[model samples]
Target: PRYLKGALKDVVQLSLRRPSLRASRQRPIISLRERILEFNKRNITAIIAVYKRKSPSGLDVERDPIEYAKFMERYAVGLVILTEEKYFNGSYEDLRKIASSVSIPILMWDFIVKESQIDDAYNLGADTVGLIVKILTERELESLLEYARSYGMEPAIVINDEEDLDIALRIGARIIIISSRDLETLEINKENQRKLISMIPSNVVKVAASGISERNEIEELRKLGVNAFEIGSSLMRNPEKIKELIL
Candidate 1:
């Protein structure tokens, strides 16, 4: 996993430059401050995906009682709680408890094996929900996302690598969370990143995720046109260092 240092600044700049015309025109009279705040409200970096692996992977999971609370307080992250018992740290109740403790928005990062799972996430108080590309057919994906959106849960498409971005766009996902860990392991090259970036419609927002650990690398990803990040292991390892990059 690579850490993207100084990536926040680049993302912010790109976002400001690429404000959705529909969103902007909706509030044409609004000042830039108001627009920026509105964007910041929805655009989030560092999705703190909390899950416990059956076997530890060495990266800090922040399962410590004190660390959990402190971690939330220290960073402004889009937290995703995976509730599946089979996956690492799968505890919807625990995630619910933490969401109650914090004020930031939370997303239910689950496998979502069924429509039943959608209700489960909403019941547990998820502000948004994650849908993976591999697990769904085109029709199923479209219907599920539309269903989730109808329920007032913002839909975010999760991608393991760049190709998934195509499916994500087809489903009309406003946000794309890229998996850097998967990218490296798959030997996805820079050209692939560029191809994916080029495919992203100017109207959509791009969010990089999975396996990012360095602040410097963040800048590189931003140069490739990412708008937000879903950072975890990196922040957990150096909470203090995060402040330097987030703003």
Candidate 2:
């Protein structure tokens, strides 16, 4: 069955933006030297399993994330869950449920708006959290990155273009996720993802997503320099695909 892609628009929050109201760590913070070292502490690698109630599909199936995660752990090195409510049909409860049952590194994929959400992700036991580049200022992004780092959680900055990549590098983002989906139309563009991936430095851990469904395509992406993959729709169709791709 055809399903919508995980494109949840998490509302931007204002509560945590007032830096003066909160006890600040606005001190001389995260140098690229420090961030690159610290972020690497968590290993988000290889074929990462993904769970979403809705994902772009020519066809699909409704499956339990916990059970699906169990099957994924049998082969996947890490897993990701889109934790939003509207467009993606996602929720934090889904993240918590999967985290409770899986041992593999769990990546919290969401349109992060506040530091509290990062805290929430941590409290729920996320190993890694996703941060979008255009959602907040470079300073805000850096602040959120440091906040997540304080909890020993690796924050993967999501980016789509050169402008966003500049922001990512300007803030010294450690883990970089190259996404094919654009925020507006919520559509996929494999070439753009590949283009952004090429521009990123080799020092950062690269996670690629969307528009990936075949074994050779992944093999080709690996050759193109993608370190890990966040795969959902295709896997939801036939998990045996993982065997053919990465096994």
Candidate maximizing TM-score: 2
TM-scores vs. true structure, each candidate: 0.70, 0.80
lDDT of 1 by residue, 142-205 (tens): 8888877666666677776555777888777877666544422344354455466667876676
Please report the TM-score between candidate 1 and the true structure.
Answer: 0.70
lDDT of 2 by residue, 167-234 (tens): 99998877788888776566888988999999889888787877777777777787887777778877
Candidate 1 regions off by >4 Å? Answer: 1-62, 65-70, 161-163, 183-194, 237-239
What is the total number of backbone clashes in candidate 1? 17
TM-score of 2: 0.80
- The number of clashing residue pairs in model 2 is 2
Query: What are the RMSDs of all candidates, in order?
Result: 12.1, 7.6
